[PDB]
Copies of this chain bind each other. A is one copy, B any other.
Amino acid sequence: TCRHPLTDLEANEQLGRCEDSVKNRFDRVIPFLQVVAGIPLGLDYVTRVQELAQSSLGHTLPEELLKDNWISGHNLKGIFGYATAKALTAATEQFSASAIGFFLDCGFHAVDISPCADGRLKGLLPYILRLPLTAFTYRKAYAGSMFDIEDDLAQWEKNELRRYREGVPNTADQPTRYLKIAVYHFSTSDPTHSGCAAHGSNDRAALEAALTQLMKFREAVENAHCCGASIDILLIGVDTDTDAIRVHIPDSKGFLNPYRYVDNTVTYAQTLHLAPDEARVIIHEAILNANRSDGWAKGNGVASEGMRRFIGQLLINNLSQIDYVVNRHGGRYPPNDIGHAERYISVGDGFDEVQIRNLAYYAHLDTVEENAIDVDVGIKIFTKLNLSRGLPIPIAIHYRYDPNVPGSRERTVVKARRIYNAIKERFSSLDEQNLLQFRLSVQAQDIGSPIEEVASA
Question: Hey, which bits of chain A sit against chain B, CB under 8 A?
Answer: 149-150, 153-154, 157-158, 160-161, 164-166, 172, 216, 219-220, 223-227, 229, 367-370, 402, 404-408, 418, 422
| Other A-B pairs, 16, CB within 8 Å; known A153-B405, A367-B369 | A149-B405, A149-B407, A157-B157, A157-B161, A160-B161, A161-B164, A161-B225, A164-B165, A164-B172, A165-B226, A166-B226, A166-B227, A224-B402, A224-B404, A367-B370, A369-B418
* Inter-chain contact B165/A216, CB cutoff 8 Å: no
**Do residues A220 and B370 form an inter-chain contact, with CB atoms below 8 A?**
no
Which residues on the B side are within 8 Å of A226 (C-beta)? 165-166
The DSSP consensus for interface residues of chain A is helix
Asked, given contacts A160-B161, A226-B166, whether A216 binds B407 with beta carbons under 8 Å apart, the answer is yes
Choose one: B164, B166, B229, B405; the contact of A220 (CB below 8 Å).
Answer: B405
A393 to B422, CA, bound (A): 27
A377 to chain B, nearest CB (A): 18
Q: How many copies does the complex hold?
A: 2
| Min distance, Cβ A446 to any Cβ of chain B, angstroms | 13
Q: How far is the CB of A129 from chain B (nearest CB, A)?
A: 28
Q: A367-B370, A407-B149 are in contact. Are A164 and B164 (CB under 8 A)?
A: yes
A368 nearest CB neighbor, chain B only: B369
Report the nearest B residue to A403, measured CB to CB: B223
Bound Cα distance from A161 to B221, whole angstroms: 13
Would you list the 7 A-B pairs with minimal beta carbon distance, nearest first? A164-B164, A223-B404, A216-B406, A369-B369, A161-B161, A220-B405, A367-B367
Chain B residue nearest in CB terms to A370 = B367
In the bound complex, how far is the Cα of B81 from the Cα of A248, in angstroms?
A: 54
A-B contact pairs, 12 of them (CB 8 A): A150-B405, A153-B405, A157-B157, A157-B158, A157-B161, A160-B161, A160-B165, A164-B172, A216-B407, A223-B405, A368-B369, A370-B418
